[PDB]
Amino acid sequence: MSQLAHNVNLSIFEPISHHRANRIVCTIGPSTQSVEALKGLIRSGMSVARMNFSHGSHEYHQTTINNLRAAATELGAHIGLALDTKGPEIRTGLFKDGGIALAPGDTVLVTSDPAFEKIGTKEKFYIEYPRLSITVRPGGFIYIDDGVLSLKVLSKEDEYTLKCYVNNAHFLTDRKGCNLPGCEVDLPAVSEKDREDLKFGVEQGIDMVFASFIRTAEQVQEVREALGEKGKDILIISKIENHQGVQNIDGIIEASDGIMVARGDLGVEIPAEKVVVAQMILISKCNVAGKPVICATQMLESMTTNPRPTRAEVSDVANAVFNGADCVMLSGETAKGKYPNEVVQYMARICLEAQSATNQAVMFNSIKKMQKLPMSPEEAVCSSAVNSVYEVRAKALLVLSNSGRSARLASKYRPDCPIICATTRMRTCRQLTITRSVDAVFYDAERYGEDENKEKRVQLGVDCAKKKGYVVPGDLMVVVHADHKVKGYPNQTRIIYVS
Amino acid sequence: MSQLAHNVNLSIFEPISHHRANRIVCTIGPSTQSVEALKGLIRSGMSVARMNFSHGSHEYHQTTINNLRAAATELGAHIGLALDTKGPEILPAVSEKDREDLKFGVEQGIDMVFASFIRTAEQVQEVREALGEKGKDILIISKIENHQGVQNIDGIIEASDGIMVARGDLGVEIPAEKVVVAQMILISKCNVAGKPVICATQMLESMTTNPRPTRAEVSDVANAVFNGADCVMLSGETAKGKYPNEVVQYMARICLEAQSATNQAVMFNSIKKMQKLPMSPEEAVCSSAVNSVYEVRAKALLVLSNSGRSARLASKYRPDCPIICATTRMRTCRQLTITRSVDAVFYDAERYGEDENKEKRVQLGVDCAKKKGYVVPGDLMVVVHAQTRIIYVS
Amino acid sequence: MSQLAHNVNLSIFEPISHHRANRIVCTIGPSTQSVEALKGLIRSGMSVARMNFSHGSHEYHQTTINNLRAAATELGAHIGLALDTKGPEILPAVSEKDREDLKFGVEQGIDMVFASFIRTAEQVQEVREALGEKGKDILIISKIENHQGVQNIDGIIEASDGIMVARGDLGVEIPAEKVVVAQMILISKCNVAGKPVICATQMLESMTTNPRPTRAEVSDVANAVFNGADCVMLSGETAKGKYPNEVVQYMARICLEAQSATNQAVMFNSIKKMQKLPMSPEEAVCSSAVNSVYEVRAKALLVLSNSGRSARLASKYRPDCPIICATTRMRTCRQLTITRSVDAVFYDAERYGEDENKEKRVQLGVDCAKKKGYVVPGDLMVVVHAQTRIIYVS
Amino acid sequence: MSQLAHNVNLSIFEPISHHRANRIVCTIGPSTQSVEALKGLIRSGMSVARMNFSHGSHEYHQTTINNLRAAATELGAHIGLALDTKGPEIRTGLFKDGGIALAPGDTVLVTSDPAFEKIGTKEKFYIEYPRLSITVRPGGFIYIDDGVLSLKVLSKEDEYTLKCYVNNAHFLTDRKGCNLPGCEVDLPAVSEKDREDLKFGVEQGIDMVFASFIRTAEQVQEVREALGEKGKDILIISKIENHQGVQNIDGIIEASDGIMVARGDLGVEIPAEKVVVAQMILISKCNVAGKPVICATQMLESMTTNPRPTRAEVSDVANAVFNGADCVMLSGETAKGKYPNEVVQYMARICLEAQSATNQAVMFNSIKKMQKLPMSPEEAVCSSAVNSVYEVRAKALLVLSNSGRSARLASKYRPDCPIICATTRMRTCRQLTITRSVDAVFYDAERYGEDENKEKRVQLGVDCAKKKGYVVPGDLMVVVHADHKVKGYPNQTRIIYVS
Ligand SMILES: O=S(=O)(O)c1ccc(/N=N/c2ccc(/N=N/c3c(O)c(S(=O)(=O)O)cc4cc(S(=O)(=O)O)ccc34)c(S(=O)(=O)O)c2)cc1
Ligand SMILES: O=S(=O)(O)c1ccc(/N=N/c2ccc(/N=N/c3c(O)c(S(=O)(=O)O)cc4cc(S(=O)(=O)O)ccc34)c(S(=O)(=O)O)c2)cc1
Ligand SMILES: [K+]
Ligand SMILES: [K+]
Ligand SMILES: [K+]
Ligand SMILES: [K+]
């Protein structure tokens, strides 16, 4: 069929029968930190709770953590726990009188020189980045205050100071943030504060990290060292925020466990129309790598204070799903907004609509056609299981995979049914929450044994699919698991009748 | 190749070598009515001037008409002129004010009507009867505004010459998420029909009074193009806006990015796989000419069509190059401004002769393509005429 | 890839690395009846011994039966035993002599019947009722001999376990050129049904009394295999012939060349594209196992099937490697000798246990493949059991 | 669709509606040299008359030529005229008593030494090939008398003499022919007799040559020189007769205008089962090169004296057509047989049946898929015209091509309708007779003018298709021709209604 052929046969009035495959990441804050409010989130469709370590102390976050664990255990939900780092920031200094008026056609001196720190004026002020004169060059741009103030660099005046053309009127106040479009920003992967944050996260047993401002594969390697041997199983989702991150996306994808497309930050740097396309490129490379991709910022922002978003906003969410994103993320809408439950429920309705309006077989065929023949046994088995789901119209795909690898591999092939992953580890259950289509179920091997014949895990997976309404008796399921000899990957498939 | 494989191989920082295929409708009002303001719009990327008959008098819009013709003649451009009806309100197809505005438009040589609040196929027939015999060559673009229009879309497409997706109107009745999917349905049914489709309302609204739009609005525009729309339309942004030229140039730049980001071969294959066998000679000749554009990597497709019909038919199949249409009618030049990929070029038969052996019209299409930097000597073009040719440009 | 691209890339002087998939039926008579002559046939490539009940008495054929079992036991081989009925002559399905010969065959443990002069589906039901309850597991291969059999082939295939294309009989009634095309139709309908098809009569007739056949006869044999036949059958060449061993070895060599010259993936795709969606679990598992053989380039497919059903079902899909079938029944070993690609291996459950976890039968299939030089440690195999596995041979 | 899907839907009782696309080459001789008998041949389905210059003088052949021209002109037929060369032969000498009995396990001495010419015996006899001891080596084989006598070379005795093992009983008589399997046979492309034959052929205006025993591309080049500037437009069809010809088939195809698969000769040299496959390989390489391929010898041999062939024979003809051959050839069946008209008519019935039982779209798709993209304009136009024929179900394809190149290019794409070729040259009409699907029609430009607008040739082509029953008014035809600027290839297509 094709996406076109799918479109002309949709009826937008028919009820949707699909089960929601995309996953919703929610940022926690004042509107949602309480145990009751977390319960609301989870009931409304939250699969991952994000802690924004730009704001708050460790105890603030500790309370998010403890409250999330009480609420989840009460509901019997597995909910991913994400730590989103502050990252290194480029800020200005102070200004006599707390701010300066700058007018287009003004020139201004920008100095990385510490002695102008707290005495900025309209003629000259401080900017924290020591490699200022090195990284930025006649003709390049410095953007300040969420990119509204645009400066074009005329010249280098001394090693400390650049002369700059003011592109637009702006009132600049103490400590605003700066961006350097198209530049190689010589800043560490992880700040000093980040290490300590990461160390907290490891101790508290987070599931994943959202690593800010990832620009090179080597920096992902730095995040990996900072988590250490103790955090070696924590996922690193690299946040792509600038041109350099988009340039190096291949090395960054290969080094990371997933990607976050941070559209707001990308937009300070890059024209809005190229951000739309960067989002597509990034999500698609992630789809082909079989690694989760999260779409973030500027989601349903207006629903932070209004009881409804604009249509342009709802279309931006849907098209994240149509581009292929595994996840969509809420920020202030859940953290400080007035409508945290409704935004999440609405986000989940948008996801359902997009999923139903997508021709899922076409994504399966696209991915499949990119495999080299001969395929490895592992790839052959997952792709063949997904095909089977299409051929017999099975209603769930059950994967026995302890680490979740094998659930991320089926999901990459995009079956049109839910994927159940039976795993011996709770951390896998929580880590699977960013992967499209997947519901993990925990197999307690301490209590029920090693299950060498896989029979208790196959029954558990089938039970999980019955409880969720995915299957009834007489429906088919496709099962993927290891034999009695292979370790590392399931090399074995069954097509079973639900009983 | 697939959209998926196209996306992974894109470089967003490479310069774009494509030539903009999507077309931009602009609403004319106080910001844009003067001769010099229309010149700027046309330079900025306007292909169609819309007159919103919900507001102003006949004499108001007469000024638009007269200034548009002055501005377009001066630049050498063929610009479609559209009359967008008030429609009825709180129903009949056309109100009494509508009958009068349509009679005026017929009298003033309009190209097309945007008919408000089309709910059924029979209603499109009433607009047609209202344009009558004298308005029989004016195009009707039915505006889809409510659930019933969405429901009756197959019959309304069959009866109309095109469709306008009025997102803001639909969103009063239908939840936002179903307007998003209704847009997809309407655009793709009109792609399969071979008929122009215009995306309207809520485009870059914020640029009415700000110098830059939000990314979400930029994404909504790119999405209209990805969905398959021929045209995007501007309302207040150009009618009342503070930055009319800038919002047009910007809407142009978005279209071009979306276009470069699209795997056009996928659209072509998908349209082609829907064709009944055996095809009519007409379908076969146009799909096969487009197929040849892909096979020999031609850099332009040239259609000789006096009515513009076979230009629309080639455009349906989505070649990944510009379509030049040599026509003996100015009115066809204006009417093709809503058709994706087409640059019309007028062949003056009075001046140059009847051209039975098509040779002069072929040389005109080729020089038109050279003039625009679409081709240079040694490139390939595919030519369709009343017949197909594959030629080297010299 | 296509048959066309396979042919241009073939090298006829390269050694063949394929393992012979097609199967050879031999008629037993005076040239071939002794224990030592049957040993030679079996070594030469016989998979099925045919007894032509048009001639000789019960006691004559009893000797064949007893000598075949002695010879096969000695070599360790499972050889199908077939009873080919006289049929009626100048009509009923089965004559009186037929009822008696069938009763004898049922009593002697035959594998399959070749039922002469099948004209309708109802006639196949009469042969079935004549084998009765005691002969309910004997296969009926309906011999197609006239225009009516050809006409009623869909119903006759549905009712039978297989078909025999009796070219010489068909050629009495139907022009030679329509027998050529009727052969194509019957073979391809049985390929699509998943049921064995035997090509018979006029195979290498001239080798009855000469040491070499003509090229035209060699071509007719290769053609049967290209058409899609599971099996080729020898009559007088082995029954009365001067060179029985040589005609078998030669028929084997022809099959192997035709096989090497066939693009097997094309047959697989063509069969697979006929499948209704949704498939049954059984169709899905076998096509998908064969698909995997092509995807990972496995060197053998192993089916655990006690009845041989899923071995026939995998064979339908035409993998380009050997199919090993581990079965708990000798009778299934004998019955699979008419099924393209299959080497059956007997799993002695009495000796080795019930094997619920399939492990011993899997190790048996793998060692069977090693023993025949189909695989070596490090190759891939695909295993189907009551479930699919892709395994490295160790 | 596929060939399989085509097969299961055939009814072999339905009348055939197709028009015969394959072409029948007939060898002329005593049964068929008369003007009346040529007329019978032509009426029965002959498209090419072959002269076998192994037998007969120039005047014998002159009479074939003059009689063929009278019969064809009387019928208004274009009939190809082929000269099939003798070629160099390897013969034995004489034997005392006119022949020797040789028994398996005998050894015998074979000598290329002239002085044993006329005095052969059971112990030693003469064989004409001076490079005997050089070309054939311990372990190689010499085959004699249409390959029934097999000798295995034990050793070289002197420069002149090989010692040989007799593989089988045989009675050997004066002058029998010898073959050297798997050998590089050091013999000229063209004998002395061949040159003179070729010279006759050029003078008499033959259409094509069947060149015997072509083993290398360089030898085709030698045939080309021997025809000369005067014969530069005569087609060379290379006869492939041994292993070396099959080894070098690529260079030979590229140098020749077509191929003849000479199955009988191949069979002396190569096991019968490998001949079947060589035939497939050769025909398919020819199909992809868009050059005619003729299948020859051992066709319906038994119908030389019997009023009907065996089924094995009829199947061998059909499968030449199914392999893709443009032509099938009769030899003694028409030259000396008792049933020359019936064999030809029957051969044409077999061709019809095979054509109808072939899925022609599958050959079109196979050929098409072997083109590199970007295609040249010429290839794009022919393949696109053939596609059009399939898409609109046109009933003829009309190609305006003076040299016939463009008719050979459509035919390669295998449309399921007849191809009409309008050409300004009678020699093209006669040369097109070996090309599948094609009926040429002569456009007399001397009389009707240059037809710069192509309109008289398009009408002529349509008239030709009406006269032959291919089209009626309201049917469609696809037309391929040049514009007012392109020379060398038609770059222009029309789809027209027949009126
Ligand atoms: O939604 S959209 O954005 O697309 C959109 C569509 C239509 C729109 N219509 N806008 C207008 C603007 C002016 C206008 N009439 N002005 C005048 C007037 O009314 C009178 S009167 O005495 O009271 O009659 C005397 C005047 C004397 C002079 S002057 O002496 O030369 O200075 C100049 C003008 C007027 C009219 S309308 O003709 O009344 O309809 C309509 C706007 C937006
Ligand atoms: O078409 S196919 O090529 O597949 C095909 C199918 C079946 C075919 N059947 N061939 C035969 C051969 C012999 C034969 N009976 N022989 C004997 C016999 O008859 C008598 S009796 O006194 O007259 O009864 C006494 C004998 C004493 C001795 S001895 O004392 O040990 O030397 C040995 C033999 C016989 C029979 S049958 O049993 O009569 O039917 C059938 C052949 C070909
Ligand atoms: K953060
Ligand atoms: K309006
Ligand atoms: K019989
Ligand atoms: K000859």
CA angle at D257 for the pair D253 and D258, rounded to the nearest 5°: 65
Contacts of D144 (CB under 8 A, 6+ apart): D92, D151, D170, D172, D176, D177, D178, D179
Is-contact B215 A263, C-beta < 8 A?
Answer: yes
| Short-list C158, C160, C114, C110, CA closest to C134 | C110
Alpha helices in chain B (DSSP H): 3-8, 35-44, 58-75, 96-108, 121-131, 147-151, 153-159, 167-173, 176-193, 215-227, 236-239, 244-260, 264-272, 281-296, 309-316, 330-335, 349-352, 359-371
Q: Are residues A254 and A268 in the same domain?
A: yes
Residue showing tokens 């300004």: D424
Is-contact A442 A463, C-beta < 8 A?
Answer: no
Chain C partners within 8 Å of A486 (Cβ): 391
Neighbours of A258 (CB within 10 A): 22
Which residues of chain A come before a gap where C and the next N are over 2.5 Å apart?
Answer: none
CB contact under 8 A, C387 and A453: no
| Three-state DSSP state, D185 | coil
Final residue before a domain boundary, out of D354, D370, D399 = D354
Is-contact D332 D365, C-beta < 8 A?
Answer: no
Contacts of C7 (CB under 8 A, 6+ apart): C261, D280, D281, D283, D284, D285
B287-309 burial by CB neighbour count: b if 16+ within 10 A, else e?
Answer: bbbbbbbbbbebbbbbbbbbebe
If you count residue pairs, one on A and one on B, with CB atoms under 8 Å apart, how many are there? Answer: 157
Q: Are residues A300 and A404 in the same domain?
A: no
**Strand D438-442 to strand D419-423: parallel, antiparallel, or no bridges (unpaired)?**
parallel
| Short-list A228, A226, A216, CA closest to A256 | A216
Strand order in the sheet with C380-384: A438-442, A419-423, A396-400, A476-481, A492-497, C388-392, C380-384, C300-304, C323-327, C342-346
**Strand D46-52 to strand D23-27: parallel, antiparallel, or no bridges (unpaired)?**
parallel
Largest CA distance in chain D: 79
Domain count, chain D: 3
Q: Are residues C284 and C228 in the same domain?
A: no
Q: Which amino acid is at B171?
A: G
Q: Residue D118: phi, psi to the nearest 5?
A: -115, 25
List the domain range (segments joined by +) for residue D380.
1-19+355-498
Q: Is C239 in the pocket of ligand 2 (CB under 6 A)?
A: yes
Ligand of minimum distance to the alpha carbon of B166: 4
Please give the structure tokens belonging to residue A375: 């395929």
Contacts of C16 (CB under 8 A, 6+ apart): C256, C257, C260
In the DSSP assignment, the letter for residue C230 is S
Is-contact A326 A290, C-beta < 8 A?
Answer: no
Q: Are residues C245 and C326 in the same domain?
A: no
Please give the structure tokens belonging to residue C46: 């016989």
With touching defined as 3+ CB pairs under 8 A, do chains A and D touch? Answer: no
Q: Is B11 in the pocket of ligand 1 (CB under 6 A)?
A: no
Q: Residue C57: phi, psi to the nearest 5?
A: -100, 170
Q: Residue A413: is it exposed, middle or buried by C-beta count within 10 angstroms (0-12/13-18/19+)?
A: buried
Ligand of minimum distance to the alpha carbon of D51: 6
Query: What's the CA-to-centroid distance between C87 and ligand 5, angstroms?
Result: 7
- Interfacial C residues in 197-226 facing D (CB < 8 Å): 202, 212-220, 222-223, 226
Neighbours of B200 (CB within 10 A): 26
CA–CA distance, B150 with B190 (Å, rounded to integer): 13
Residue showing tokens 């800043």: A187
Contacts of C15 (CB under 8 A, 6+ apart): none
Contacts of D382 (CB under 8 A, 6+ apart): D406, D409, D410, D412, D413, D480
Q: Are residues B245 and B273 in the same domain?
A: no
Question: Distance of CA D150 to CAs C80, C212, C294, D102, Å?
Answer: 38, 13, 43, 10
Chain A partners within 8 Å of C280 (Cβ): 392
Alpha helices in chain C (DSSP H): 3-8, 35-44, 58-75, 96-108, 121-131, 147-151, 153-159, 167-173, 176-193, 215-227, 236-239, 244-260, 264-272, 281-296, 309-316, 330-335, 349-352, 359-371
List the determination method: X-ray
Q: Residue C371: is it exposed, middle or buried by C-beta count within 10 angstroms (0-12/13-18/19+)?
A: exposed
Q: Is C64 in the pocket of ligand 2 (CB under 6 A)?
A: no
Q: At what angle do helices B215-227 and A311-323 cross, to 10 degrees?
A: 60
Q: Are residues B162 and B80 in the same domain?
A: yes
Residue showing tokens 């599931």: A207
CA angle at C107 for the pair C102 and C112, rounded to the nearest 5°: 55
Query: What's the CA-to-centroid distance between D55 and ligand 6, angstroms?
Result: 8
CA angle at D406 for the pair D401 and D409, rounded to the nearest 5°: 160
Q: State in Å, rounded, how far the first CA of chain B is from the last one.
A: 32
Pocket test of ligand 1: the residue of B55, B58, B61, B67 to mutate, having most ligand atoms within 8 Å of its CB, is B55
Three-state secondary structure of D212-260: CCCCCHHHHHHHHHHHCCCCCCCEEEEEECCHHHHHCHHHHHHHCCEEE
Final residue before a domain boundary, out of A153, A188, A223 = A188
Q: Residue A150: phi, psi to the nearest 5?
A: -105, 120
Q: Are residues B77 and B184 in the same domain?
A: yes
Q: How many CA atoms lie within 13 A of B69 on its CB side?
A: 11
Q: State in Å, rounded, how far the first CA of chain C is from the last one.
A: 32
Q: How many CA atoms lie within 13 A of D329 on its CB side?
A: 29
Counting as contact any 3 or more CB pairs under 8 A, the partners of D are B, C
| Short-list B273, B272, B179, CA closest to B227 | B179
Q: Which atom of ligand 1 is nearest to the CA of B240?
A: 3
> C interface mutation test: which of D277, D300, D322, D414 has the most C CBs within 10 A?
D277
Is-contact C375 C299, C-beta < 8 A?
Answer: yes
Please give the structure tokens belonging to residue B330: 């100015």
Is-contact B316 B324, C-beta < 8 A?
Answer: no
Residue C45's CATH number: 3.20.20.60
Q: State in Å, rounded, how far the first CA of chain D is from the last one.
A: 32
Please give the structure tokens belonging to residue B172: 């009063």
In the DSSP assignment, the letter for residue A18 is -
| Short-list B251, B238, B157, CA closest to B196 | B157
Q: Can you give the C-alpha Rg of chain B in angstroms? A: 20
Is-contact D25 D327, C-beta < 8 A?
Answer: yes
Neighbours of A81 (CB within 10 A): 25
Is-contact A414 A326, C-beta < 8 A?
Answer: no
CA–CA distance, A235 with A250 (Å, rounded to integer): 18
Q: Please provide the size of chain C in residues.
A: 394
CA–CA distance, A439 with A421 (Å, rounded to integer): 6
In the DSSP assignment, the letter for residue A92 is B
| Short-list A298, A301, A302, CA closest to A279 | A298
Is-contact C10 C40, C-beta < 8 A?
Answer: no
Q: E strands, D344-388, where?
A: none
CB contact under 8 A, A384 and C387: no
- Residues of D annotated catalytic, as ranges: 50, 91, 239, 297
Pocket test of ligand 1: the residue of B57, B100, B235 to mutate, having most ligand atoms within 8 Å of its CB, is B57
Residue showing tokens 């914020």: B206
Q: Residue D165: is it exposed, middle or buried by C-beta count within 10 angstroms (0-12/13-18/19+)?
A: middle
Is-contact A82 A48, C-beta < 8 A?
Answer: yes
| Short-list A442, A430, A394, A457, CA closest to A292 | A430
| Three-state DSSP state, C181 | helix
Please give the structure tokens belonging to residue A396: 């769930």
The whole-angstrom distance between residue A233's C-alpha and the CA centroid of its chain comes to 17
Is-contact B23 B338, C-beta < 8 A?
Answer: yes
Strand order in the sheet with D178-179: D124-126, D107-111, D161-166, D149-156, D141-144, D178-179
| Three-state DSSP state, B82 | strand
Final residue before a domain boundary, out of D354, D377, D397 = D354
Q: State in Å, rounded, how far the first CA of chain A is from the last one.
A: 32
Q: Is C160 in the pocket of ligand 2 (CB under 6 A)?
A: no
CB contact under 8 A, C357 and A493: no
Neighbours of C312 (CB within 10 A): 27
Question: Distance of CA B74 to CAs B79, B244, B342, D133, Å?
Answer: 12, 20, 21, 92
Query: In chain C, whose CA is at the least distance from the CA of A376?
Result: C296
Residue C111 Cα, gap to closest chain D Cα (Å): 28
| Short-list D109, D128, D262, D108, CA closest to D185 | D128
Q: Are residues A78 and A202 in the same domain?
A: yes
Q: Are residues C8 and C43 in the same domain?
A: no
Question: Distance of CA A254 to CAs A217, A237, A288, D342, Å?
Answer: 8, 11, 11, 74
| Three-state DSSP state, B217 | helix
Q: Are residues B247 and B266 in the same domain?
A: no
Residue A265 known to bind ligand: yes
Helix (H) or strand (E) holding B81: strand B80-84
Counting as contact any 3 or more CB pairs under 8 A, the partners of C are A, D
D219-231 burial by CB neighbour count: b if 16+ within 10 A, else e?
Answer: bbeebbebbeeeb
The whole-angstrom distance between residue C248's C-alpha and the CA centroid of its chain comes to 15
Query: What's the CA-to-centroid distance between B254 and ligand 3, angstroms?
Result: 30
Q: Are residues B120 and B188 in the same domain?
A: yes
CA–CA distance, A264 with A252 (Å, rounded to integer): 20
Please give the structure tokens belonging to residue B92: 């009949």
Q: Which atom of ligand 1 is nearest to the CA of B59?
A: 38
CA–CA distance, C20 with C10 (Å, rounded to integer): 18
Query: What's the CA-to-centroid distance between D279 and ligand 6, angstroms?
Result: 19
Query: In chain D, whose CA is at the least distance from the CA of C259?
Result: D277
Neighbours of A313 (CB within 10 A): 23
Alpha helices in A228-359 (DSSP H): 243-247, 249-255, 263-269, 272-289, 311-323, 332-335, 340-357
Nearest CB neighbour to B296, from listed D375, D391, D492: D375
Contacts of D305 (CB under 8 A, 6+ apart): D337, D338
CA–CA distance, D407 with D434 (Å, rounded to integer): 11
Q: Are residues C79 and C146 in the same domain?
A: yes
Chain D interface includes B380 (CB < 8 A): yes
Please give the structure tokens belonging to residue A230: 């103790």
CA–CA distance, B127 with B142 (Å, rounded to integer): 9
| Three-state DSSP state, A305 | coil
Neighbours of B104 (CB within 10 A): 16
Please give the structure tokens belonging to residue A454: 């896989």
| Three-state DSSP state, A277 | helix
Residue C293 Cα, gap to closest chain D Cα (Å): 21
CB contact under 8 A, D5 and C274: yes
Residue A127's CATH number: 2.40.33.10
Q: Is B239 in the pocket of ligand 1 (CB under 6 A)?
A: yes
Q: Which amino acid is at C300?
A: A
Chain C interface includes A361 (CB < 8 A): no
The whole-angstrom distance between residue C334's C-alpha and the CA centroid of its chain comes to 10
Is-contact A377 A491, C-beta < 8 A?
Answer: yes
With touching defined as 3+ CB pairs under 8 A, do chains A and C touch? Answer: yes
Q: Which amino acid is at D408?
A: R
Long-range CB contacts for residues C265-269, cutoff 8 Å, separation at least 24: C265/C1, C265/C294, C265/C320, C266/C1, C266/C2, C266/C3, C266/C6, C266/D2, C267/C191, C267/C228, C267/C318, C267/D4, C268/C294, C268/C317, C268/C318, C268/C319, C268/C320, C269/D2
Q: Is B29 in the pocket of ligand 1 (CB under 6 A)?
A: yes
Please give the structure tokens belonging to residue A443: 């197999």
Residue D1 Cα, gap to closest chain C Cα (Å): 8
- Residues of A annotated catalytic, as ranges: 50, 91, 239, 297
Q: Which amino acid is at A53?
A: F
Residue D241 known to bind ligand: yes
| Short-list D209, D213, D207, D208, CA closest to D179 | D213
Residue A7's CATH number: 3.40.1380.20
Q: Can you give the C-alpha Rg of chain C in angstroms? A: 20
